[PDB]
Design a binder for these strands. Structure first.
Ligand SMILES: Nc1ccn([C@H]2C[C@H](O)[C@@H](COP(=O)(O)OP(=O)(O)OP(=O)(O)O)O2)c(=O)n1
Length: 580
DNA sequence: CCTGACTCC
DNA sequence: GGAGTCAGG
């Protein structure tokens, strides 16, 4: 059964062929400044295992890695590329990434290792990484013979699977999406991750000191009001205090007990002074635990930067996600939380943070795909879309739209953009499911093209088995035929929503590629730091801001051409907070 | 590991 | 809705 390979003591020329499957193995989950434990190369001449201390000190091997004309096929090339960047080594010529190929073919398979990808093509001559390295505390790199066989089997699987994966991508009309969008993007994400974002840790620490004082004060008030100490962070002890001791109304349950979500608590505040204090304690506690202490824990001491990892192969809509830290959920809506952004600063003296965001990209994409005459006209006039939606839903003029009317319309728009259910919209607006349905009905009367689109896309999903985005990203929807109303309805909502969210993801990814090219052409030092779904964050010398003010929005706006314009807003300043 | 809560888009 | 993190259990 064993797979033959050369356990090489040195690099030879036959290992440096112009086409190879390459494995550069980084076992730590967070690959920043992490060890490379082994290397495997499979090519027309054979299968090879190399020790990294050897290969990575060999000038011929390093040249080969960096030579764009030497083509490599890999799985999760970004992990290898970043780990190699920390060692001062450039990885070029990666022409196929099996992780990104599998992700595009079917994001729902949850492919996160070579074995899982291989199984899509009935190839099982490779073990799952979890089986080799173990999990959790028991996780460890195995002895060399076991390690080397595993890496060689992964390389062999990649070597064999490239053709069938590319063939299926071609059949799906997704090969350009892989080769021209996701693969080039992977390189850009690697650069962003490696650059990192500078943190003003002293400022974070000062905030933490103040929060600790405020938390102690509120905490003690809560105990006084409760007539008893308890763990406020325990949903169980808190529920006992609120709903048994203090006898507050139970307005909502969880599957295991009493709900204490903020929405519920706000409704209970009139009955007892403890409630507003718990809400305040929660708010401060979230900041302290997640955005002060949690952030400080992942700052690299050598440079005071944080280096996120963008998971490019996870979400079902084509979005990225961000981990360790997550830099896509830093507070902004409320001022107390927004101040956390003062801690994210430029990495060089006399540089600034520049932030550019699409204005209503999801609803603009919807206008385009649905060809809804009224929605397209609204965006061609660059109307405030929530005010316009209120005018239409309520049949009033602009100067008759009250704040609460605009709020209801905005909630409907939020619902369309995220594909939430009537129940969800009812919750969000604190109204009956019945009234939520009525809102949706008025929306479709004013936007009949959107109605027709939603009908048609659900039918298309049922017929084809999947829906697609503008650039041919796919999502399979097997639950669309379910005889369970809730399950089916969830799938119908995903059919409606994925082309919206997913096409918006496609567009910003293309914009990132275009922007990186333009910055290089223009010889700017500006570079990308972060993407937050519909916005891009850069830093640059202060002397580049005026140019960026023209260049960045233009590139973002021109990434695709739709039936409506795209519009990008932008700001800059001395910290991320000030880039507003 | 699971639940519940909460932060962003 | 759907990502990730925290805390509790
Ligand atoms: N072999 C292909 C063909 C297309 N695409 C993706 C990227 C393209 O930018 C996008 C749009 O393709 P087209 O411009 O070719 O449009 P089509 O002719 O395919 O029709 P439609 O876009 O309506 O599907 O689809 C792809 O990834 N691989």
């Amino acid at each position: 059964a064993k797979m033959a390979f050369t356990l090489a003591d040195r690099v030879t020329e036959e290992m440096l062929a112009d086409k190879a499957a390459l494995v550069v193995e980084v076992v730590e989950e967070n690959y920043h400044d992490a060890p490379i434990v082994g290397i495997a190369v499979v090519n027309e001449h054979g299968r090879f295992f190399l020790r990294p201390e050897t290969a990575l000190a060999d000038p011929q091997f390093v040249a080969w890695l960096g030579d764009e004309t030497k083509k490599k096929s890999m799985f999760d090339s970004k992990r290898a590329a970043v780990a190699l960047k920390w060692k001062g080594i450039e990885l070029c010529g990666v022409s196929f990434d099996l992780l990104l190929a599998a992700y595009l073919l079917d994001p729902a398979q949850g492919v996160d290792d070579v074995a899982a990808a291989a199984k899509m093509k009935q190839y099982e001559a490779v073990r799952p990484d979890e089986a080799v390295y173990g999990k959790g505390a028991k996780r460890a790199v195995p002895d060399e013979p076991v390690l080397a066989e595993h890496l060689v089997r992964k390389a062999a699987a990649i070597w064999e699977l490239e053709r069938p994966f590319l063939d299926e991508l071609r059949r799906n009309e997704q090969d350009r999406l892989l080769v021209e969008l996701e693969q080039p993007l992977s390189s850009i994400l690697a650069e962003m991750e490696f650059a990192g974002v500078k943190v003003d840790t002293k400022r974070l620490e000062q905030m933490g000191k103040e929060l600790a004082e405020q938390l102690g004060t509120v905490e003690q008030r809560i105990y006084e009001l409760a007539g008893q100490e308890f763990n406020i962070n325990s949903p169980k002890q808190l529920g006992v205090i609120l709903f048994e001791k203090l006898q507050l109304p139970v307005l909502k349950k969880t599957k295991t007990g009493y709900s204490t979500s903020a929405d519920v608590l706000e409704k209970l505040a009139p009955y007892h002074e403890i409630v507003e204090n718990i809400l305040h304690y929660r708010q401060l506690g979230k900041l302290q635990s997640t955005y002060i202490e949690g952030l400080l824990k992942v700052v690299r001491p050598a440079t005071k930067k944080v280096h996120t990892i963008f998971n490019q192969a996870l979400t079902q809509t084509g979005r990225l996600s961000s981990t360790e830290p997550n830099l896509q959920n830093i507070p902004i809506r409320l001022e107390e939380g927004r101040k956390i952004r003062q801690a994210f600063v430029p990495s060089e003296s006399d540089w600034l943070i520049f932030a550019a965001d699409y204005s209503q990209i999801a609803l603009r994409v919807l206008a385009h795909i649905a060809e809804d005459d009224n929605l397209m006209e609204a965006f061609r006039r660059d109307l405030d879309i929530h005010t316009k939606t209120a005018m239409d839903i309520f049949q009033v003029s602009e100067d008759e739209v009250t704040p609460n009317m605009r709020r209801q319309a905005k909630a409907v728009n939020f619902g369309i953009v995220y594909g939430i259910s009537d129940y969800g919209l009812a919750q969000n607006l604190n109204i009956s499911r019945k009234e939520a349905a009525e809102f949706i009905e008025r929306y479709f009367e004013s936007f009949p093209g959107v109605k027709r689109y939603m009908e048609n896309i659900v039918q298309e999903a049922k017929q084809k088995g999947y829906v697609t985005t503008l650039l041919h990203r796919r999502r399979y929807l097997p639950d669309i035929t379910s005889r369970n109303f809730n399950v089916r309805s969830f799938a119908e909502r995903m059919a409606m929503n994925t082309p919206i969210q997913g096409s918006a993801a496609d567009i910003i990814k293309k914009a990132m590629i275009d922007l990186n090219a333009r910055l290089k052409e223009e010889r700017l030092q500006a570079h990308l730091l972060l993407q937050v779904h519909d916005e891009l964050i850069l830093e640059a010398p202060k002397e580049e801001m005026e140019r960026l003010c023209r260049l960045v929005p233009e590139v973002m706006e021109q990434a695709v051409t739709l039936r409506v314009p795209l519009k990008v807003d932008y700001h800059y300043g001395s910290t991320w907070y000030d880039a507003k």
